Amino acid sequence: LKFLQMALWSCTRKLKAASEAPEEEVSLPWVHLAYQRFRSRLQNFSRILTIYPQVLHSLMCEMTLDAFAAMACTEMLTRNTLKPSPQAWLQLVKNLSMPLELICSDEHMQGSGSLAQAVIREVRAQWSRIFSTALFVEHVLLGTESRVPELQGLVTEHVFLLDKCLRENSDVKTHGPFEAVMRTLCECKETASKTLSRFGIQPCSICLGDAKDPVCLPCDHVHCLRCLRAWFASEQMICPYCLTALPDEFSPAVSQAHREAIEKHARFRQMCNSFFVDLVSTICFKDNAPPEKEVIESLLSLLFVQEHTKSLSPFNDVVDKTPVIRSVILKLLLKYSFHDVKDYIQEYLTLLKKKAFITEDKTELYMLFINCLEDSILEKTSAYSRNDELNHLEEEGRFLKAYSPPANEASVEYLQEVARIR
Amino acid sequence: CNEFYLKTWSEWEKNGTPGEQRNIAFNRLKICLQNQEAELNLSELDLKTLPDLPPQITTLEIRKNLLTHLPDLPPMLKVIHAQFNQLESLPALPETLEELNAGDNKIKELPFLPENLTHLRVHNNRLHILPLLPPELKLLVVSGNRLDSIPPFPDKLEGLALANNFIEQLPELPFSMNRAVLMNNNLTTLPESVLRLAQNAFVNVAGNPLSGHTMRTLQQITTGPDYSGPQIFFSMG
Amino acid sequence: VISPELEHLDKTLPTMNNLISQDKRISSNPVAKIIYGDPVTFLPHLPRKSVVHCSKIWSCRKRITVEYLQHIVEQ
Ligand SMILES: [Zn+2]
Ligand SMILES: [Zn+2]
């Protein structure tokens, strides 16, 4: 109650200071006006303290208590990482996300002074870091617990290493933090692979995937049974990866230890991939400003193995046997204004179409773009107000008036015209 | 120096961290040193570092350990089976090296291959380019690497493996060949000479984006049974 | 009884669409040729140069809604 008094008092002082004239006396009416103007900020502060009352102890002309509460929370989360238990910390992080992200919203803090802005500048780095770590927990740690508990301790350690690689600069929309997170996730995967099998885990030297129905040998290299059946043709049962001297009487079978190991590493890779996808979507592709050039270039370089396509992933160990195309990064980039991202999208289209994954009759690929572009517009348009809806309809009329027409191919501006016209 | 060699091994032993069956290693090393056995073993003992081991050995298994680096290799250590160490690169290969296996290591560049290297196995390293090959290289296994180019092949390239690499074009495989494996490379086109080989060479090119016309060419040539060439394969499933 | 039928609509609906579109009652109508087939066969004015001047890029599309999501979840 004292802190809410201090907040509404500072709001009232600020509001009265703009009374068109000196503020000789602060009467009661202004208290209602301040409440009406700063209602959301105060309610959010109350919610914060309800979620994490301890913040009070951390606290002990301008409205700043909400930002100080947010800073206290991010500190009593960076220090209380995974306490009392990973689920309770994750759940606290999650609950606070909404009010903290509100406080880190520029519209929510319209008119904020220089102190509030300076606080929020750092609160945003802290929150982005805390959220990256929370997603790493939620996906890799918790899942590791049930599916692959042998690794739960190692992932716990890497949780804190993630917090530290984001500590200084936690804006993963930049290059350094994004590359650092990727380095961390690759080191975690490699170490987990070494844990699940101290001979490691390597893919079938025949199919270059992980050895479905694993068949180990006196040299411990792993292959698939079906691959060894096809391999067993004649005079060439001796492994390729090793050229071992084969006692011709050898006849293989399934070694359980490796199938369980591979299952564990596949669950691990799936969780790390889900973490990277969720980080990109929630953190990297969040702002009302598009990420830098180097981050997007790196993402597009990852989607293609040097070509073969794969799901959005930092690991060069999963691949779509057939050249599958998926809409993820297109849907993310289109969140922003097409005018900024068009060159990224055309580079993506040309890089797919560079005889890399598609050959001809690409009418279905273009429909993917056409639908993604249409989604962006629908996504934006459903946000518009009714007066904004009428203005938009006028702008579309003016575009239809302005539109007038190379062949044998399309471009992302042309496909965007097609989407808009549709 | 035998006293100093086992002494240094006991000294590294005092560094014995969890998992390291250094006791078993130390007995094996000392017996070999005093009996001057031509062979040593260190397999599966989860070692992370190697002191200098007896010189007069001509064979060694250090597989399934966790080393990240090797000391000088004895001049006589002809035969190494070092599969699954964590070596980030290979120190000096001695004069008489006749066989090496370096599977699942972390090497990225090899030292020079001696003249007597009748066999090499360096699978699953992270190499990008290979040193020169000797004329007597009866075997090269370089699969698992990231090689974008491949140096010439010697007189007697009997055995070859190249899977998981990035080789795009292959030097001429002479009649010395009897067992070729060349899958999942960057192969643009590979010569017809692979046909001239004997009637018993296994030749696989699966997983490659080879010239569709080159495959159709090789079918046209082989289905013209006039050739007494080897057994050639292109994919399985 | 019904669920088995709805499960297979992806297959069963193209069959009925074809049988209707190919009927003499309809196949001589241009609107049907526009809805079901490719009008390029019977419209000469239609450009054919740019991949964007195809028939599918100018085809219908699944309107995303809450109810469609609900159905998909149920499935
Ligand atoms: Zn396989
Ligand atoms: Zn082997």
XYZ file of C-alpha atoms and ligand atoms in Angstrom:
736
model
C 0.000 0.000 0.000
C 2.899 2.361 0.698
C 4.454 1.561 -2.663
C 1.181 2.031 -4.519
C 0.852 5.362 -2.709
C 4.350 6.318 -3.831
C 3.526 5.359 -7.407
C 0.205 7.184 -7.638
C 1.828 10.156 -5.876
C 4.607 10.351 -8.457
C 2.049 9.950 -11.235
C -0.019 12.789 -9.783
C 3.002 15.067 -9.420
C 4.046 14.387 -13.016
C 0.532 14.883 -14.364
C -0.003 18.131 -12.458
C 3.373 19.480 -13.569
C 1.728 19.733 -17.019
C -1.217 21.804 -15.736
C -0.719 24.453 -18.454
C 0.470 26.625 -15.557
C 2.345 26.410 -12.233
C 1.254 23.557 -9.966
C 0.974 25.531 -6.719
C -1.327 22.934 -5.128
C -1.993 19.268 -5.884
C -5.709 18.718 -5.338
C -7.592 15.420 -5.148
C -8.927 15.437 -8.734
C -5.465 14.844 -10.168
C -5.225 11.589 -8.234
C -8.103 10.232 -10.264
C -6.570 11.532 -13.480
C -3.249 9.924 -12.669
C -5.058 6.696 -11.903
C -6.910 6.917 -15.181
C -3.710 7.681 -17.095
C -1.452 5.199 -15.259
C -4.048 2.536 -14.424
C -2.401 -0.311 -16.326
C 1.065 0.381 -14.934
C -0.195 0.227 -11.350
C -2.335 -2.863 -11.890
C 0.656 -4.564 -13.502
C 2.802 -3.654 -10.495
C 0.173 -5.143 -8.183
C 0.075 -8.319 -10.271
C 3.874 -8.514 -10.136
C 3.920 -8.288 -6.358
C 1.141 -10.871 -6.102
C 3.174 -13.276 -8.243
C 6.463 -12.574 -6.438
C 5.837 -10.753 -3.142
C 9.519 -11.107 -2.258
C 10.116 -8.206 -4.661
C 9.033 -5.869 -1.869
C 12.195 -6.642 0.086
C 14.233 -6.035 -3.056
C 12.697 -2.583 -3.486
C 13.617 -1.681 0.094
C 8.350 13.414 -10.039
C 8.047 10.346 -12.256
C 6.443 6.898 -12.153
C 9.175 4.258 -11.927
C 8.090 1.585 -9.432
C 6.877 -0.811 -12.137
C 10.269 -0.798 -13.863
C 12.093 -1.273 -10.566
C 9.788 -4.172 -9.732
C 10.586 -5.708 -13.119
C 14.324 -5.308 -12.539
C 13.995 -6.854 -9.087
C 12.106 -9.811 -10.552
C 14.649 -10.432 -13.303
C 17.351 -10.408 -10.630
C 15.384 -12.660 -8.248
C 15.095 -15.000 -11.190
C 18.655 -14.832 -12.485
C 19.823 -15.611 -8.946
C 17.014 -18.080 -8.220
C 17.610 -20.022 -11.432
C 15.917 -23.434 -11.132
C 14.967 -22.907 -7.495
C 13.028 -24.356 -5.756
C 12.586 -26.784 -8.649
C 12.965 -26.370 -12.420
C 9.206 -26.496 -12.871
C 8.541 -23.827 -10.255
C 11.141 -21.484 -11.674
C 9.980 -22.090 -15.233
C 6.398 -21.486 -14.122
C 7.354 -18.289 -12.314
C 9.266 -17.027 -15.335
C 6.222 -17.865 -17.453
C 3.754 -16.095 -15.167
C 5.946 -12.986 -15.004
C 6.481 -12.968 -18.779
C 3.206 -11.168 -19.458
C 3.727 -8.268 -16.996
C 7.466 -8.053 -17.717
C 6.856 -7.973 -21.463
C 4.187 -5.331 -20.896
C 6.740 -3.250 -19.003
C 9.222 -3.841 -21.831
C 6.615 -2.572 -24.313
C 7.190 0.894 -25.742
C 3.462 1.593 -26.048
C 2.823 0.490 -22.460
C 5.443 3.005 -21.274
C 4.461 5.979 -23.425
C 5.692 9.151 -21.767
C 8.127 7.255 -19.552
C 10.963 9.448 -18.362
C 14.661 8.866 -18.810
C 15.002 6.789 -15.638
C 12.177 4.426 -16.608
C 13.581 4.107 -20.131
C 17.066 3.444 -18.760
C 15.696 0.751 -16.457
C 13.681 -0.923 -19.207
C 16.699 -0.905 -21.523
C 18.412 -3.340 -19.158
C 15.243 -5.150 -18.115
C 14.873 -6.142 -21.764
C 18.319 -7.729 -21.944
C 17.653 -9.531 -18.683
C 14.219 -10.716 -19.768
C 15.382 -11.940 -23.170
C 18.114 -13.901 -21.405
C 15.726 -15.315 -18.812
C 13.287 -16.354 -21.533
C 15.970 -18.041 -23.624
C 17.002 -19.997 -20.542
C 13.385 -20.784 -19.650
C 12.769 -22.223 -23.108
C 15.982 -24.226 -22.865
C 14.732 -25.661 -19.581
C 11.193 -26.325 -20.791
C 12.317 -28.158 -23.898
C 15.681 -29.803 -23.209
C 15.731 -30.230 -19.417
C 12.200 -31.319 -18.538
C 12.005 -33.571 -21.588
C 15.429 -34.973 -20.731
C 14.052 -35.891 -17.320
C 11.430 -38.369 -18.484
C 12.923 -39.459 -21.795
C 16.685 -39.447 -21.150
C 17.342 -38.869 -17.427
C 20.964 -39.973 -17.819
C 21.541 -36.524 -19.312
C 19.414 -34.439 -16.937
C 22.451 -33.298 -14.970
C 24.434 -32.294 -18.035
C 21.567 -30.288 -19.460
C 21.238 -28.643 -16.071
C 24.804 -27.417 -16.341
C 24.286 -26.130 -19.844
C 21.244 -24.203 -18.671
C 23.498 -21.892 -16.730
C 26.006 -21.705 -19.550
C 23.240 -20.386 -21.743
C 22.403 -17.711 -19.201
C 26.047 -16.672 -19.255
C 26.436 -16.479 -23.035
C 23.429 -14.144 -23.147
C 24.463 -12.192 -20.040
C 26.419 -9.337 -21.605
C 24.370 -8.891 -24.798
C 21.139 -10.900 -24.738
C 19.679 -9.441 -27.953
C 19.773 -12.619 -30.012
C 18.374 -10.618 -32.919
C 22.061 -9.766 -33.356
C 24.811 -12.058 -34.608
C 26.968 -12.704 -31.548
C 24.310 -14.036 -29.180
C 22.690 -16.145 -31.901
C 25.985 -17.762 -32.870
C 26.785 -18.252 -29.184
C 23.488 -20.020 -28.497
C 24.141 -22.223 -31.509
C 27.656 -23.066 -30.324
C 26.208 -23.916 -26.916
C 23.515 -26.168 -28.339
C 26.010 -27.985 -30.554
C 28.363 -28.550 -27.625
C 25.447 -29.842 -25.564
C 24.414 -32.249 -28.311
C 27.963 -33.515 -28.842
C 28.447 -34.077 -25.111
C 25.094 -35.859 -24.840
C 26.105 -38.082 -27.752
C 29.335 -38.958 -25.965
C 27.373 -39.691 -22.788
C 24.767 -41.987 -24.345
C 27.582 -44.098 -25.812
C 31.260 -43.685 -25.000
C 31.911 -44.847 -28.551
C 29.661 -41.928 -29.393
C 26.884 -42.004 -31.950
C 27.655 -41.813 -35.657
C 25.282 -42.282 -38.586
C 25.141 -45.322 -40.820
C 28.119 -45.013 -43.159
C 25.833 -46.504 -45.830
C 22.704 -44.340 -45.608
C 24.449 -41.523 -43.663
C 21.471 -41.387 -41.315
C 21.439 -42.817 -37.827
C 21.434 -46.598 -38.000
C 17.817 -47.687 -37.863
C 17.910 -51.251 -36.570
C 21.539 -50.832 -35.475
C 24.048 -53.548 -36.302
C 27.361 -53.245 -34.481
C 30.467 -55.225 -35.294
C 33.884 -56.247 -33.905
C 35.011 -52.764 -34.993
C 32.013 -51.071 -33.286
C 30.980 -49.057 -36.340
C 27.201 -48.971 -36.581
C 24.998 -49.780 -39.557
C 21.414 -50.754 -40.280
C 20.241 -54.315 -40.803
C 18.386 -53.477 -44.027
C 21.486 -51.645 -45.223
C 23.614 -54.692 -44.408
C 21.147 -56.899 -46.296
C 21.519 -54.733 -49.386
C 25.276 -54.609 -48.697
C 25.705 -58.377 -48.358
C 25.648 -58.850 -52.135
C 28.933 -60.708 -52.563
C 32.618 -60.337 -51.698
C 31.641 -57.029 -50.077
C 30.206 -57.843 -46.683
C 33.303 -56.225 -45.149
C 32.396 -52.831 -43.794
C 33.140 -49.874 -46.104
C 33.826 -47.386 -43.338
C 36.680 -49.597 -42.095
C 37.657 -52.351 -44.583
C 37.832 -54.896 -41.782
C 39.032 -58.442 -42.380
C 35.762 -60.377 -42.253
C 35.501 -63.969 -41.064
C 33.115 -64.879 -43.868
C 30.972 -66.940 -41.487
C 29.890 -63.755 -39.699
C 26.157 -63.093 -39.725
C 24.868 -59.921 -38.041
C 22.012 -59.010 -35.699
C 20.607 -56.109 -33.676
C 22.626 -54.808 -30.714
C 20.083 -53.343 -28.299
C 22.479 -50.975 -26.522
C 22.935 -48.906 -29.642
C 19.273 -48.777 -30.610
C 18.449 -47.394 -27.169
C 21.363 -44.956 -27.401
C 20.230 -43.735 -30.825
C 16.663 -43.386 -29.564
C 17.955 -41.242 -26.719
C 20.037 -39.037 -29.007
C 17.110 -38.636 -31.414
C 14.893 -37.476 -28.563
C 17.663 -35.102 -27.512
C 18.099 -33.698 -31.023
C 14.344 -33.256 -31.276
C 14.261 -31.271 -28.054
C 17.232 -29.077 -28.972
C 15.669 -28.401 -32.377
C 12.371 -27.478 -30.733
C 14.293 -25.113 -28.472
C 16.087 -23.423 -31.352
C 12.803 -23.070 -33.245
C 11.076 -21.564 -30.222
C 13.962 -19.187 -29.550
C 13.948 -17.979 -33.153
C 10.174 -17.544 -33.201
C 9.652 -15.967 -29.777
C 12.890 -14.056 -29.179
C 14.709 -13.475 -32.452
C 11.635 -12.763 -34.590
C 9.750 -10.688 -32.029
C 10.472 -6.991 -32.454
C 8.659 -4.483 -34.623
C 12.013 -4.203 -36.412
C 13.421 -7.066 -38.480
C 16.555 -8.872 -37.284
C 19.915 -8.017 -38.785
C 21.121 -9.320 -42.131
C 23.624 -11.783 -40.674
C 21.097 -13.652 -38.528
C 18.696 -14.245 -41.407
C 21.532 -15.136 -43.764
C 22.731 -17.681 -41.211
C 19.269 -19.201 -40.820
C 18.932 -19.600 -44.585
C 22.430 -21.083 -44.756
C 21.392 -23.619 -42.123
C 18.182 -24.705 -43.834
C 20.339 -25.995 -46.711
C 23.152 -28.533 -46.358
C 25.970 -28.018 -48.850
C 22.212 -29.197 -51.735
C 19.773 -30.950 -49.396
C 16.947 -29.422 -47.374
C 16.164 -30.085 -43.725
C 13.925 -28.808 -40.971
C 14.877 -25.573 -39.247
C 17.853 -26.789 -37.230
C 21.498 -25.958 -36.407
C 22.547 -29.611 -36.728
C 24.017 -31.080 -39.914
C 22.753 -34.542 -38.974
C 19.061 -34.494 -39.988
C 17.979 -34.159 -43.611
C 14.797 -34.486 -45.642
C 15.519 -37.423 -47.944
C 13.262 -35.827 -50.512
C 13.686 -32.053 -50.985
C 10.930 -30.917 -48.630
C 10.085 -27.213 -48.422
C 8.446 -25.738 -45.327
C 7.063 -22.307 -44.574
C 8.572 -21.481 -41.165
C 11.139 -18.792 -41.928
C 8.889 -17.297 -44.602
C 6.112 -16.971 -42.035
C 8.488 -15.359 -39.577
C 10.063 -12.865 -41.971
C 6.689 -11.858 -43.390
C 5.632 -10.751 -39.897
C 7.393 -7.478 -40.696
C 6.973 -5.042 -43.575
C 7.524 -6.748 -46.911
C 9.630 -3.791 -48.023
C 12.382 -4.671 -45.540
C 12.364 -8.460 -45.991
C 11.740 -8.777 -49.725
C 15.405 -9.254 -50.578
C 15.739 -11.946 -47.921
C 12.712 -13.761 -49.298
C 13.911 -13.515 -52.886
C 17.316 -14.821 -51.811
C 15.548 -17.733 -50.125
C 13.426 -18.444 -53.199
C 16.382 -18.252 -55.581
C 18.483 -20.392 -53.254
C 15.834 -23.106 -53.217
C 15.276 -22.757 -56.976
C 19.011 -22.731 -57.786
C 18.594 -26.344 -58.930
C 19.233 -27.012 -55.237
C 15.897 -28.600 -54.310
C 13.405 -27.930 -57.136
C 13.802 -28.527 -60.859
C 10.725 -27.410 -62.824
C 6.944 -27.131 -62.605
C 7.463 -24.921 -59.563
C 3.864 -23.692 -59.506
C 3.451 -25.350 -56.111
C 6.499 -23.653 -54.615
C 5.188 -20.282 -55.698
C 1.848 -21.107 -54.140
C 3.644 -21.586 -50.878
C 5.046 -18.105 -51.116
C 1.722 -16.771 -52.318
C 0.013 -18.213 -49.290
C 2.658 -17.075 -46.838
C 2.470 -13.558 -48.223
C -1.304 -13.702 -48.033
C -1.059 -14.797 -44.426
C 1.106 -11.825 -43.558
C -1.508 -9.486 -44.938
C -4.365 -11.314 -43.283
C -2.343 -11.345 -40.092
C -1.814 -7.605 -40.226
C -5.285 -6.863 -41.550
C -7.152 -8.657 -38.771
C -5.441 -6.238 -36.361
C -6.905 -3.173 -38.082
C -9.706 -1.058 -36.656
C -12.843 -0.286 -38.654
C -11.595 3.150 -39.705
C -8.220 1.584 -40.449
C -10.158 -1.073 -42.365
C -11.763 1.598 -44.550
C -8.405 3.311 -45.080
C -6.903 -0.059 -46.042
C -9.695 -0.663 -48.540
C -8.961 2.757 -50.041
C -5.271 1.896 -50.302
C -6.149 -1.369 -52.036
C -8.306 0.567 -54.474
C -5.365 2.842 -55.211
C -3.107 -0.182 -55.693
C -5.577 -1.680 -58.156
C -5.606 1.648 -60.000
C -1.802 1.777 -60.002
C -1.102 -1.856 -60.893
C 0.077 -2.474 -64.448
C 2.551 -5.125 -65.686
C 9.723 -11.064 -66.588
C 8.093 -14.105 -68.164
C 9.212 -17.709 -67.579
C 9.743 -16.928 -63.878
C 8.401 -14.997 -60.900
C 9.817 -12.681 -58.255
C 8.813 -12.068 -54.672
C 7.461 -8.631 -55.550
C 5.439 -10.186 -58.362
C 4.240 -13.002 -56.121
C 3.361 -10.339 -53.563
C 1.346 -8.472 -56.163
C -0.394 -11.756 -56.984
C -1.087 -12.400 -53.298
C -2.399 -8.873 -52.792
C -4.560 -9.032 -55.918
C -5.933 -12.383 -54.788
C 64.859 -44.647 -20.202
C 62.510 -47.589 -19.609
C 62.625 -46.698 -15.914
C 61.758 -43.114 -16.748
C 59.031 -44.223 -19.155
C 57.151 -46.362 -16.626
C 57.952 -43.711 -13.995
C 56.243 -41.049 -16.094
C 53.308 -43.415 -16.613
C 52.915 -43.806 -12.846
C 53.231 -40.024 -12.618
C 50.384 -39.516 -15.063
C 48.670 -42.230 -13.002
C 48.681 -40.040 -9.905
C 46.600 -37.761 -12.157
C 44.110 -40.640 -12.340
C 40.627 -39.146 -12.551
C 37.324 -41.077 -12.390
C 36.657 -43.769 -14.970
C 40.311 -44.195 -15.962
C 41.392 -47.842 -15.656
C 44.964 -46.590 -15.362
C 45.813 -49.533 -13.105
C 45.203 -51.973 -15.964
C 47.032 -49.690 -18.387
C 50.034 -49.421 -16.081
C 50.398 -53.192 -15.689
C 49.985 -53.735 -19.435
C 52.520 -51.020 -20.224
C 55.115 -52.278 -17.748
C 54.844 -55.936 -18.774
C 55.268 -54.828 -22.390
C 58.221 -52.597 -21.475
C 60.172 -55.188 -19.481
C 59.348 -58.175 -21.686
C 59.962 -55.746 -24.583
C 56.808 -57.033 -26.242
C 56.295 -55.805 -29.795
C 52.711 -54.862 -28.855
C 50.951 -52.721 -26.274
C 47.318 -52.119 -25.371
C 45.369 -49.265 -23.823
C 41.855 -50.000 -25.082
C 38.686 -48.861 -23.310
C 40.561 -47.438 -20.300
C 38.974 -43.976 -20.782
C 42.411 -42.334 -20.765
C 42.582 -38.620 -21.560
C 46.359 -38.295 -22.007
C 49.225 -40.549 -23.062
C 52.816 -40.422 -21.830
C 55.571 -41.884 -23.985
C 55.020 -45.633 -24.253
C 57.613 -48.340 -24.985
C 59.547 -47.631 -28.190
C 60.163 -51.102 -29.608
C 56.451 -51.843 -30.134
C 55.212 -52.484 -33.677
C 51.482 -52.696 -32.910
C 49.035 -50.997 -30.595
C 45.371 -50.775 -29.676
C 44.352 -47.540 -27.972
C 40.788 -47.690 -29.192
C 37.725 -46.632 -27.210
C 39.832 -44.362 -24.990
C 39.263 -40.590 -24.694
C 42.654 -39.111 -25.604
C 42.660 -35.694 -27.260
C 46.346 -35.754 -28.245
C 49.223 -38.177 -28.696
C 52.888 -37.896 -27.737
C 55.586 -38.852 -30.223
C 54.821 -42.177 -31.844
C 57.617 -44.774 -31.604
C 59.676 -45.215 -34.777
C 58.602 -48.871 -34.972
C 54.880 -48.416 -34.208
C 53.835 -49.793 -37.577
C 50.266 -50.720 -36.680
C 47.933 -48.409 -34.760
C 44.268 -49.136 -34.087
C 43.349 -45.838 -32.432
C 39.658 -45.887 -33.323
C 37.650 -43.552 -31.076
C 40.122 -41.312 -29.493
C 39.428 -37.564 -29.390
C 42.675 -36.557 -31.101
C 42.282 -33.126 -32.673
C 45.187 -33.879 -35.035
C 47.769 -36.553 -35.728
C 51.373 -36.137 -34.550
C 54.384 -37.455 -36.448
C 53.751 -40.771 -38.153
C 56.967 -42.815 -37.841
C 59.052 -44.097 -40.718
C 57.715 -47.658 -40.695
C 53.980 -47.002 -40.283
C 52.256 -49.833 -42.155
C 48.709 -49.539 -40.811
C 46.662 -46.956 -38.955
C 43.046 -46.747 -37.876
C 41.892 -43.366 -36.582
C 38.129 -43.757 -36.611
C 35.852 -41.288 -34.844
C 38.778 -39.043 -33.893
C 38.631 -35.238 -34.166
C 41.561 -34.750 -36.549
C 41.301 -31.971 -39.131
C 44.660 -32.211 -40.944
C 46.970 -35.188 -41.316
C 50.759 -35.324 -41.217
C 52.623 -36.839 -44.148
C 51.883 -40.457 -45.016
C 55.127 -42.491 -44.921
C 56.355 -44.498 -47.879
C 55.362 -47.878 -46.411
C 51.716 -46.998 -45.657
C 50.190 -50.072 -47.252
C 47.003 -49.361 -45.282
C 45.366 -46.257 -43.891
C 42.052 -45.811 -42.107
C 41.158 -42.274 -41.028
C 37.381 -42.526 -41.190
C 35.105 -40.053 -39.393
C 37.762 -37.372 -38.953
C 37.067 -33.739 -39.902
C 39.669 -33.460 -42.653
C 39.268 -31.061 -45.558
C 42.305 -32.122 -47.624
C 44.574 -35.162 -47.714
C 48.385 -35.264 -47.737
C 50.209 -37.064 -50.516
C 49.775 -40.818 -50.881
C 52.664 -43.286 -51.244
C 53.020 -45.559 -54.285
C 52.232 -48.672 -52.207
C 48.953 -47.462 -50.681
C 47.164 -50.807 -50.954
C 44.357 -49.164 -48.966
C 42.905 -45.751 -48.249
C 39.864 -45.249 -46.039
C 38.964 -41.565 -45.816
C 35.214 -41.854 -45.358
C 33.388 -39.656 -42.876
C 35.574 -36.637 -43.660
C 34.696 -33.333 -45.361
C 37.157 -33.496 -48.250
C 36.277 -31.255 -51.189
C 39.161 -32.477 -53.374
C 41.197 -35.670 -53.592
C 44.900 -36.074 -54.484
C 46.156 -38.696 -56.951
C 45.859 -42.428 -56.363
C 49.008 -44.581 -56.334
C 50.114 -47.693 -58.191
C 48.323 -50.250 -56.030
C 45.041 -48.726 -54.840
C 43.389 -52.073 -54.125
C 41.002 -50.930 -51.392
C 39.305 -47.549 -51.326
C 36.493 -45.950 -49.352
C 35.274 -42.381 -49.817
C 31.747 -42.183 -48.377
C 30.470 -39.102 -46.530
C 33.126 -36.955 -48.222
C 32.680 -34.021 -50.616
C 34.845 -35.269 -53.485
C 33.416 -34.230 -56.848
C 35.768 -35.867 -59.366
C 37.973 -38.937 -59.029
C 41.445 -39.616 -60.448
C 41.833 -42.646 -62.680
C 41.380 -45.943 -60.817
C 43.994 -48.292 -62.340
C 43.699 -52.079 -62.612
C 45.030 -52.272 -59.043
C 41.472 -51.703 -57.812
C 39.473 -54.588 -56.394
C 37.139 -52.985 -53.817
C 35.840 -49.450 -54.382
C 33.237 -47.562 -52.343
C 32.478 -44.008 -53.446
C 28.966 -43.205 -52.226
C 27.373 -39.923 -51.132
C 30.132 -37.731 -52.559
C 29.832 -34.602 -54.737
C 30.470 -36.771 -57.792
C 29.819 -34.868 -61.022
C 30.946 -37.620 -63.399
C 33.320 -40.513 -62.937
C 35.453 -42.079 -65.673
C 34.630 -45.157 -67.707
C 37.998 -46.648 -66.665
C 36.169 -48.127 -63.636
C 34.873 -50.644 -66.205
C 38.324 -51.756 -67.387
C 38.891 -53.289 -63.934
C 38.699 -57.021 -63.284
C 35.431 -58.976 -63.112
C 35.388 -58.877 -59.285
C 35.610 -55.235 -58.164
C 32.745 -53.962 -56.032
C 32.017 -50.400 -57.163
C 29.259 -48.403 -55.456
C 28.375 -44.787 -56.237
C 25.053 -44.505 -54.414
C 23.817 -41.288 -52.846
C 25.637 -39.128 -55.374
C 23.994 -36.519 -57.650
C 25.963 -37.983 -60.549
C 25.188 -37.153 -64.159
C 22.010 -38.977 -65.085
C 23.481 -39.260 -68.552
C 26.690 -40.730 -67.102
C 24.695 -43.468 -65.349
C 22.798 -44.120 -68.571
C 26.186 -44.210 -70.325
C 27.565 -46.825 -67.943
C 24.443 -48.973 -68.338
C 24.767 -48.692 -72.119
C 28.423 -49.753 -71.896
C 27.974 -52.640 -69.439
C 24.776 -53.939 -71.054
C 27.052 -54.188 -74.073
C 28.530 -57.341 -72.533
C 31.660 -56.949 -74.681
C 33.125 -55.584 -71.434
C 34.692 -57.998 -68.944
C 34.562 -55.288 -66.291
C 33.659 -55.400 -62.621
C 30.346 -55.495 -60.763
C 29.074 -51.910 -60.585
C 26.266 -50.705 -58.327
C 24.469 -47.370 -58.067
C 21.837 -47.610 -55.301
C 19.965 -50.037 -53.041
C 16.679 -50.107 -51.163
C -21.282 -45.022 -39.108
C -20.555 -41.529 -40.456
C -16.967 -41.071 -39.267
C -15.519 -43.676 -41.688
C -16.982 -41.658 -44.551
C -15.686 -38.250 -43.495
C -12.231 -39.728 -42.942
C -11.815 -40.379 -46.685
C -13.108 -37.123 -48.183
C -9.684 -36.223 -49.608
C -10.133 -39.173 -51.973
C -13.913 -39.386 -52.340
C -14.547 -35.723 -53.213
C -12.249 -35.501 -56.277
C -14.087 -38.528 -57.699
C -17.491 -36.866 -57.449
C -16.082 -33.560 -58.683
C -14.703 -35.310 -61.766
C -17.911 -37.239 -62.440
C -19.926 -34.012 -62.227
C -17.507 -31.875 -64.232
C -17.196 -34.511 -66.968
C -20.960 -34.894 -67.364
C -22.434 -33.706 -70.653
C -24.783 -31.517 -68.609
C -21.806 -29.480 -67.385
C -18.666 -30.171 -69.420
C -20.097 -27.946 -72.180
C -20.404 -25.045 -69.703
C -17.484 -22.603 -69.338
C -18.110 -21.764 -65.674
C -17.576 -25.422 -64.787
C -14.411 -25.517 -66.891
C -13.265 -22.533 -64.832
C -14.142 -24.108 -61.488
C -12.945 -27.685 -62.011
C -10.588 -27.779 -65.000
C -8.028 -25.485 -66.573
C -9.759 -22.827 -68.719
C -6.610 -22.433 -70.846
C -8.052 -25.279 -72.909
C -11.019 -23.106 -73.892
C -9.948 -19.514 -73.155
C -7.390 -18.257 -75.714
C -6.892 -14.844 -74.114
C -5.292 -16.480 -71.076
C -1.529 -15.822 -70.959
C 0.678 -18.891 -70.738
C 4.178 -17.413 -70.387
C 4.832 -16.827 -66.689
C 4.514 -19.555 -64.068
C 2.272 -17.049 -62.312
C -0.088 -17.296 -65.307
C -0.898 -20.924 -64.438
C -4.245 -22.298 -63.265
C -3.323 -23.292 -59.712
C -1.795 -19.980 -58.615
C -5.259 -18.625 -59.459
C -7.098 -21.453 -57.694
C -9.094 -21.394 -54.493
C -7.515 -21.809 -51.076
C -8.446 -23.142 -47.660
C -9.816 -20.322 -45.513
C -8.366 -20.697 -42.020
C -10.899 -20.360 -39.208
C -11.516 -21.447 -35.634
C -13.915 -24.192 -36.725
C -11.422 -25.672 -39.194
C -8.795 -25.744 -36.440
C -11.324 -27.405 -34.129
C -12.036 -30.091 -36.727
C -8.314 -30.653 -37.274
C -7.718 -31.045 -33.539
C -10.605 -33.512 -33.298
C -8.983 -35.489 -36.119
Zn 21.636 -46.754 -42.704
Zn 35.542 -51.322 -38.859
